């Protein structure tokens, strides 16, 4: 699924993702524009052989099992291909987890580099949320 902007801010903060770990709304959506496009089915194979997952590009190294990435942990505890669902209720799980894990966004490398310190609200502008 290929999610609107104002779409996606709406299932995120249903899921509890707003100001999660003091996160506001539109970090969520900014990191999952540069993430995923907005793109449910979006995935990337990193260097190291682990690969990225849906809507938050989701790693299954540490957080979800593909059966291909030595050494996967699936501390989120489900297989890869749940996070491709059109339903982004597992990715907000597994995002919550993350986010907890004590570098808060810093651990998605395009929220970092492309929305830390950036005026993330305008990822909510006209959003009837
Ligand atoms: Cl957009
Ligand atoms: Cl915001
Ligand atoms: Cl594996
Ligand atoms: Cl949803
Ligand atoms: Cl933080
Ligand atoms: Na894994």
Redesign the pocket.
Known sequence: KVFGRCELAAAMKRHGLDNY???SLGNWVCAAKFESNFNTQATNRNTDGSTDYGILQINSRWWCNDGRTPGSRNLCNIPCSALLSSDITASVNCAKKI?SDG???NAWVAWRNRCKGTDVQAWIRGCRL
Request: hydrophobic share 30%.
């Open positions: 770990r003091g996160y986010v570098n808060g966004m």
